[PDB]
Structure formats: C-alpha cells, structure tokens
Amino acid sequence: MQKLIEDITKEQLRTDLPAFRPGDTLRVHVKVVEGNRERIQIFEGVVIKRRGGGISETFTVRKISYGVGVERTFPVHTPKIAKIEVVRYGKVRRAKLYYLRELRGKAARIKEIRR
C-alpha cells in the first residue's frame, strides 16, 4: 500500500488497543447514544475475523444473546469503542472462524491458551 495513504491516516490510528487475534474473547466497550445521554454497552464475544489494513482494518465479534447469534463488525480504530479488553486467548487453527456460525453450545467451545 502507498506510504502516502499510510501517512494521511496515521493520526487516526488508535495506539491503546491490545493485541488480539481470531479466537480471542473480547469485551468491547461500545459508546452508545440512546436519547441525549451517552453510555457504554459491553459486547463480549469471540473474535471471528480480522481483515484489512491500516485505518480500514475491521474485526468481527460473535455472541449468542438470548438464543440468537449476533455478530458486530467494528473498524479497529473506531473512536466509538471506549476500550477492548481480552478476556481469554483462544487456540484456533485459522484466521477466519466462520465455521462457528453453524455451531452452538459445546461444539462451539474454543480451548484457552496460557498466553
């Protein structure tokens, strides 16, 4: 990729994010604005993908909520995320965990790493 696009966008890259990879469990603290009030909704879930480069990098987290799978895809460097905290590092064998979309319950379990 152009150094020029890299240079224009460098200022908007967040530095405060922890290293995570697909299979890690995050709590993503999302700024939310229902009404005029501002509050933090937490989205806890498995990272199922992380694609793209630089300011365009996104990640997707998946949770089962009330018996329904939910995925939220965020720009890595969105200012709408207050913070990300890694709950547990998973042991997976690939970059994209789309096979989890078809699994529920015990079949959908990811082993932890001592990282």
């Binding site: 229902e34 009330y66 329904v68 995925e71 939220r72 969105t78 709408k80």
Partner: protein
C-alpha cells in the same frame, strides 16, 4: 434483505411462529426490506391457542436479519436469523413479550414498545 416469499421466525408471543412475506411496504416496486421495515405477511405456522391464527394476513416489523445493518460509524450488526414482530397499525406489538435481541435501528423508526419489551437491544 427480506423479499416476497421470505419466511421469518416471529420473535414474540402473539401466536404466530412463522410468517411468509407477502409484500415489502413503502413504494411501488420496492424489492427488499431490512431491519425496522414493515411487511405484510401471512401466518404459516401458529402456536395452538394464540391470538394470531394460521392463515391471517398481518403486518410485522423486521427486528433481526442475517443481512443485518450498517451504522454511520462504519460498524455492522448481523444476526443468525430473520425475525419479525406482528404489529398493529400504530406500531404497538400484538403480543406482550419479545424474544431474542433486537437491533438498535428500531428506536430510529419509533418502535418504542418493541424496544422496551426486548431482552436486549444491540
């Protein structure tokens, strides 16, 4: 992305279990409906004893979809299923309980009773 013939789970206790989409509302040749859009639909499967009966034509608001929805901040939400809630003309749900998480987009369209009844709004 819900169109004519798309079947949806019903995310409420109105009596309908599954509906078939008869029509996306809101303009002449409109192909597709998304979260927060209203559809006309027929009840294909019903719970025995419910208020809403099999074969009834009803309005419903879509509250989750597999296609999901994009937000102005460049984030997305998707669900594992397509689901709707049977409504009256004033947007109030015909049932008394909503099951499963609904999308924040329903606040924007002024489906407040649904948003209040939902166990989670993501």
């Amino acid at each position: 992305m819900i169109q004519q013939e798309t079947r949806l789970k019903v995310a409420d206790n109105s009596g309908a279990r599954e509906v078939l989409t008869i029509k996306v509302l809101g303009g002449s040749g409109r192909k597709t409906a998304n979260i927060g859009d209203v559809i006309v639909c027929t009840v294909k499967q019903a719970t025995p004893g419910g208020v809403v009966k099999k074969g009834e034509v009803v309005k419903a608001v879509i509250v989750r979809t597999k296609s999901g929805a994009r937000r102005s901040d460049g984030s997305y939400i998707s669900f594992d299923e397509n689901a709707c809630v049977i409504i009256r003309d004033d947007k109030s749900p015909r049932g008394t309980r909503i099951f499963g998480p609904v999308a924040r987009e329903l606040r924007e369209n002024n489906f407040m009773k649904i948003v209040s009844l939902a166990p989670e709004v993501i």
